[PDB]
C-alpha cells in the first residue's frame, strides 16, 4: 500500500519504467515510500538513471534491490541517492570495496557470500553515523571483523538492530558490541560459538528487548542469564543443551519475556513447569518438537494469561483409557479462557477432537479463534467435511 | 539426459503435452526414464489421462510431481501406474488417506505438512514390500508413528534409504528401526531428541554407511560411538556439544569414514589433532565456522591423504609477524601434495595470497585444482584482475 514492487525483465522494460518514474506528477508522492525492484538486472547507466529519477522524488525513502546481480561499482552509483534512508542489497555480488551513503538509516547485505565483512565493518565504523539497522546475515563475519566496532573513533553508535545470523560469531565477538547501548534487537542465531558465555556477555546491553539465539549451543547457564534480563522476545530454538537443569531455584520469575520460542530443544514435562513458574509473562509460547506429553501441555495451559501456544509434532494421542486422557486435555484447552490460538498439528489429535475445541455458537467466555493455524470460522466446515467424508 | 522436465502452465498446455506423450513412436523409448512435471497443477482427469499415457510407456520408471497441489484422491489415480518405480510427491497437500502402489521402490513425501505420518507409516508397513527409499522429511513424524515398523507382519523390510530430516524423532524412535538391517543411508538431521543415546542405538545397523546427524544434540559420547562404526559419510554439523572432550583415548583410529562434516560445532585446534589421529581416512573434511586458527588448519593438512578441505569463515589472517605466520600456512598448503581443493572464503586470506597458491605452469607434483569453489584455471585471471584493479 506504500510500496511499488516490480520485476523488470528487459532493458527495454527498465526504460519504460524509468519513463513512468520521470513523470513530473510523481515528484510530490508521499503515499509510496518504498520501491522494490528485486530480481531486476541493471546496467550501470540504467542504475545511474534510476538514481537520477529517484533523486527528484523525495517521498521515496526506501529502495530494495535484492538479487539484482549488483557489484561494488553499482554501490558507488547508489551512494549518490539523496533521499533514500533504507537500502536493501541482499543476495548480490558485493565484494571487497562497496561504498555506502553515510545518511543511510538501514542497510541490508544478507547473503552477499563474496562480501568482505572486514572492509564493510571497517568502512561503516568510519562513516555510518546515522545507521540504525544493519544486517550482515550469512556474510562470513568472524569475531576479528567485529573489532572495528570498539574503535574510539567508530561512528557506528546509533545501531538499534543488528542481524548477524549464520556467521561465525563467538563470545569473544559479543564483547565487541556489548558497549553499543542503543541495541534493542539482535539476531545471533546459527552462531554456535556463542554458547552460554556469549549470552552472559549480553548483560550490559540494558535496552536489548528482542534476541534471536536459535542454534547457538545454549544450555542451562544461558537460559538463566536470559531469565535475569529485561527481554521481551527470545528465540532459543535448536538448543538441546536446554534438555538439562536450568538452575533457576534462586532466580525470581521473569515478567518481561512475552514471546518465548523453545522448539527443538529436547525439553520434557518438567521444563514446562519451569516455564510457567519462571517465565509467567511468556504468553506467546512455542514448544513444538520436544519431549512433552499431555501432562506438559496441561502445565503450560495453567498459565492464567497464556494466549498463543504451539505444542505440535509431539504425540498427544495415539490410536479406551487413552481416550479419557485425551479428552481431559481437550477439556483443559476449552477451560483455558485467555487462549487465542493453539497449534496441535501432528499430535495425533483427530478431526472430531479438533472440531470439539471450536467455541460453541455465541460463546462469550472463550477467546479461542485459531486452531492449527486456521481461523475457527474457516476450520469448522473444513473439518466437518473430513469427518463426513470418512463415514 | 535421461529426464524430461517441464512446467505445464495451463490445462491446454497439459493436453498438448498429453498429445505428444500418446504418440506411438514414444512407446519404445528407453533413454528417457524419468518425467518431471513438478509445479504443474492437474485436474483429476488430466492426471488419470497422464497415468493412461505413461502406462503405455514401460521405459519411464520415475515420475516427479513436486509442488503440484496434489491431494489424497490424486494418489489413488497415481497408484494405477504400472511401470513407475520411483514417485516423488514433495510439497503437496496429502493428508490422512493417501494410497500408494505396492510396486514402488522409491517414494518421496518431503514437506507434505498436512500429512498423517501415522497412517502413512501404518499403510506402508502393511503393503510396501518393494520399497527401498522412503523420504518423510518435514512430515511431522514422531516416535509413536515409527512403532509400526516393529510389527511382526510389517512388509517394510527392504528399506535402504530413510530420510527423517526435521521431524521429532528421539532415541526411542531409533529403536523402532534398529532391526532394519538393510538400511545403508539415514538422514536424522534436525531431530534434536536423538542425542548421544540415539546415536548409540544405531550400532546394530551393520550396513549403515551414510549418516546425517546435523542438529541432533550430539556430544562427545555420540562421536565416540560413531568412531566405532563402519560408516563412510557422516554429517555432524550444528552439534556444538562436540566442543568438549571426545573420549577417544582407548579407541582405535577409524579407517572407514571418508567424508566428515563438522561445521558449526564450536571446535578448536585440539579437535583438529583428534580428527587426523582418530579419523585418518576422513579425507573430505569440512570444519568451517569453528574456533580453529592457522595451527588447527596446519594440523588437518598433516593428514597425508587429505583431498578436500573446507576451513572457511575462520580468521586465518588479520590485516609483519602476522604476515610470516600466514605465509607459513600458505607454504604448508602448497606442500600438501594430495590436496585437490581447499576453501578459504572469509578467512582474511587475500587475493595475492590466493593467487600464490595456484600451482605453477606445468607443476607435476601438486594436485590442487579448486580454491574457494573455483577451478584454478578460471580463478587465476579473475584474481589477477582484482589485484590489478586495486593499484
Interface list for chain A against chain B, based on CB atoms closer than 8 Å: 95-96, 113, 117-118, 140-145, 167-168, 170, 190, 192-193, 195, 215, 217, 238, 240-241, 243, 264-266, 289-291, 312-315, 318-319, 345-346, 348, 386
CB atoms A290 and B193 under 8 Å: yes
Assess contact for B134 and B167: CB atoms under 8 A.
Answer: no
The CA distance from B372 to B386, in Å, is 15
If residue A313 lies in a helix (H) or strand (E), which one and from where to where? none
The CA distance from A154 to A152, in Å, is 6
Question: Which residues in chain B touch residue A346, judged by CB atoms under 8 angstroms apart?
Answer: 117, 140-142
Say if strands B374-375 and B370-371 run parallel, antiparallel, or are unpaired. Answer: antiparallel
If residue A107 lies in a helix (H) or strand (E), which one and from where to where? strand A106-108
The CA distance from A109 to A117, in Å, is 10
**Residue B291's closest chain A neighbor by CA?**
A193
Q: How far is A78 from chain B (nearest CA, A)?
A: 21
Q: Among A142, A348, A386, whose Cβ lies nearest the Cβ of B118?
A: A348
Question: Which residues in chain A touch residue B319, judged by CB atoms under 8 angstroms apart?
Answer: 118
User: In this structure, which topology does domain A1-391 adopt according to CATH?
Assistant: 3.80.10
CB atoms B313 and A140 under 8 Å: yes
CB atoms B291 and A318 under 8 Å: no
Residue B163's beta-bridge partner residues?
B135, B187
The CA distance from B236 to A129, in Å, is 42
The CA distance from A80 to B150, in Å, is 67
CB atoms A348 and B265 under 8 Å: no
Q: Which three cell numbers stand for residue B66?
A: 513436486
Select the residue from A168, A238, A318 to test the B interface by mutation, using most B Cβ atoms within 10 A.
A168
Half-sphere CA count of B186, side-chain side, radius 13 A: 26
Phi, psi of B66 (to 5 degrees): -80, 140
Identify the residue whose cell numbers are 494410497: B99
Contacts of B211 (CB under 8 A, 6+ apart): B185, B186, B188, B202, B226, B231, B233, B234, B235
The CA distance from A366 to B316, in Å, is 59
CB atoms A290 and B168 under 8 Å: yes
Q: Which three cell numbers stand for residue A178?
A: 556489548
Closest CA to B282 of B231, B245, B238, B246: B231
Q: Which three cell numbers stand for residue A197?
A: 558465555
Assess contact for B124 and B100: CB atoms under 8 A.
Answer: yes
If residue A235 lies in a helix (H) or strand (E), which one and from where to where? strand A233-235
Interface list for chain B against chain A, based on CB atoms closer than 8 Å: 95-96, 113, 117-118, 140-145, 167-168, 170, 190, 192-193, 195, 215, 217, 238, 240-241, 243, 264-266, 289-291, 312-315, 318-319, 345-346, 348, 386
The CA distance from A57 to A24, in Å, is 9
Closest CA to A242 of A278, A203, A206: A278
Q: How far is B347 from chain A (nearest CA, A)?
A: 8
The CA distance from A337 to A65, in Å, is 46
Select the residue from A117, A167, A174, A192 to test the B interface by mutation, using most B Cβ atoms within 10 A.
A192
CA–centroid distance for A244 within its chain = 26
Assess contact for A194 and A167: CB atoms under 8 A.
Answer: no
Q: How far is A238 from chain B (nearest CA, A)?
A: 7
The CA distance from A142 to B311, in Å, is 13
Assess contact for B58 and B83: CB atoms under 8 A.
Answer: yes
Identify the residue whose cell numbers are 594430495: B338
What is the SS3 assignment for B285?
strand
Distances (CA, A) of B187 to B76, B140, B324: 28, 15, 43
Q: Among B117, B193, B266, whose Cβ lies nearest the Cβ of A346?
A: B117
Number of A/B CB contacts below 8 angstroms equals 107
Return left, alpha or beta for B285; rule: phi > 0 is left, psi -120 to 50 is alpha, else beta.
beta
Question: How many CB atoms are closer than 10 A to CB A377?
Answer: 10
Cα torsion for A201, A207, A212, A218, to the nearest 10°?
Answer: 30
> By what method was this entry solved?
X-ray
Q: How far is B262 from chain A (nearest CA, A)?
A: 12
Q: How far is B115 from chain A (nearest CA, A)?
A: 8
CB atoms A192 and B168 under 8 Å: no
DSSP state, A359? P
Question: Which residues in chain B touch residue A190, judged by CB atoms under 8 angstroms apart?
Answer: 238, 264
Q: How far is B40 from chain A (nearest CA, A)?
A: 23
**Residue B389's closest chain A neighbor by CA?**
A97
Q: Which three cell numbers stand for residue A36?
A: 522494490
Phi, psi of B160 (to 5 degrees): -110, -30
Q: How far is B23 from chain A (nearest CA, A)?
A: 36
The CA distance from A289 to A144, in Å, is 36
Assess contact for B226 and B250: CB atoms under 8 A.
Answer: no
Question: Which residues in chain A touch residue B142, judged by CB atoms under 8 angstroms apart?
Answer: 313-315, 346, 348
Q: How far is A169 from chain B (nearest CA, A)?
A: 9
Q: How far is B311 from chain A (nearest CA, A)?
A: 12
CB atoms A217 and B243 under 8 Å: yes
Select the residue from A173, A263, A287, A313 to test the B interface by mutation, using most B Cβ atoms within 10 A.
A313
CB atoms B315 and A142 under 8 Å: yes
The CA distance from A29 to B109, in Å, is 49
Q: Among B168, B217, B314, whose Cβ lies nearest the Cβ of A313?
A: B168
Assess contact for A371 and A358: CB atoms under 8 A.
Answer: yes
Question: Which residues in chain A touch residue B289, judged by CB atoms under 8 angstroms apart?
Answer: 167-168, 192-193
Burial of B197 (0-12, 13-18, 19+ CB in 10 A): middle
Taking each helix axis from N to C end, the angle separating A11-22 and A44-54, rounded to the nearest 10 degrees, works out to: 20
Q: How far is B166 from chain A (nearest CA, A)?
A: 9
The CA distance from B258 to B278, in Å, is 12
Q: Which three cell numbers stand for residue B242?
A: 562436540
Question: How many CB atoms are closer than 10 A to CB B281?
Answer: 16
If residue B74 lies in a helix (H) or strand (E), which one and from where to where? helix B72-78
Amino acid at each position: 500500500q506504500h510500496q511499488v514492487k516490480l520485476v523488470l525483465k528487459t532493458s527495454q522494460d527498465i526504460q519504460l519504467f524509468l519513463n513512468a518514474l520521470r513523470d513530473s506528477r510523481n515528484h510530490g508522492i508521499s503515499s509510496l515510500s518504498e520501491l522494490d525492484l528485486s530480481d531486476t538486472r541493471f546496467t550501470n547507466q540504467e542504475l545511474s538513471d534510476l538514481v537520477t529519477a529517484l533523486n527528484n522524488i523525495p517521498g521515496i525513502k526506501s529502495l530494495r534491490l535484492d538479487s539484482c546481480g549488483l557489484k561494488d561499482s553499482d554501490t558507488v552509483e547508489l551512494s549518490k541517492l539523496t533521499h533514500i534512508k533504507k537500502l536493501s542489497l541482499k543476495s548480490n555480488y558485493l565484494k571487497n570495496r562497496p561504498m555506502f551513503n553515510s545518511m543511510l538509516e538501514a542497510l541490508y547485505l544478507d547473503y552477499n557470500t563474496e562480501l568482505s565483512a572486514s572492509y564493510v565493518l571497517f568502512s561503516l565504523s568510519r562513516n555510518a553515523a546515522a545507521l540504525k539497522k544493519l544486517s550482515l546475515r550469512n556474510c562470513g563475519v568472524t569475531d576479528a571483523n567485529l573489532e572495528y566496532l570498539t574503535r574510539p573513533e567508530s561512528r557506528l553508535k546509533s545501531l538499534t538492530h543488528f542481524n548477524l545470523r549464520r556467521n561465525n560469531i563467538t563470545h569473544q565477538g559479543v564483547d565487541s558490541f556489548a558497549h553499543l547501548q542503543s541495541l534493542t534487537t539482535i539476531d545471533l542465531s546459527q552462531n554456535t560459538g556463542i554458547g552460554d558465555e556469549g549470552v552472559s556477555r549480553l548483560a550490559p546491553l540494558k535496552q536489548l528487548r528482542t534476541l534471536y539465539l536459535d542454534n547457538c549451543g545454549i544450555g542451562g547457564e544461558g537460559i538463566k542469564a536470559i531469565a535475569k534480563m529485561n527481554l521481551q522476545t527470545v528465540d532459543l530454538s535448536f538448543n538441546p543443551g536446554l534438555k538439562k537443569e536450568w538452575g533457576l531455584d534462586d532466580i525470581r520469575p521473569n515478567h518481561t519475556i512475552r514471546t518465548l520460542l523453545l522448539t527443538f530443544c529436547s525439553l520434557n514435562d518438567n521444563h514446562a513447569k519451569l516455564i510457567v513458574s519462571k517465565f509467567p509473562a511468556a504468553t506467546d509460547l512455542n514448544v513444538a518438537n520436544n519431549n512433552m506429553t499431555r501432562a506438559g501441555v496441561k502445565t503450560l495451559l495453567s498459565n492464567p494469561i497464556i494466549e498463543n501456544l504451539d505444542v505440535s509434532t509431539q504425540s498427544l494421542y495415539a490410536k479406551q483409557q487413552e481416550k479419557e486422557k485425551a479428552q481431559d486435555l481437550l477439556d483443559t484447552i476449552c477451560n483455558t479462557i485467555t487462549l487465542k490460538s493453539i497449534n496441535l498439528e501432528h499430535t495425533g489429535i483427530t478431526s472430531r477432537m479438533l472440531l470439539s475445541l471450536i467455541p460453541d455458537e455465541t460463546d462469550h467466555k472463550r477467546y479461542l479463534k485459531k486452531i492449527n493455524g486456521v481461523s475457527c470460522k474457516e476450520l469448522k466446515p473444513k473439518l466437518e467435511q473430513q469427518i463426513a467424508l470418512r463415514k
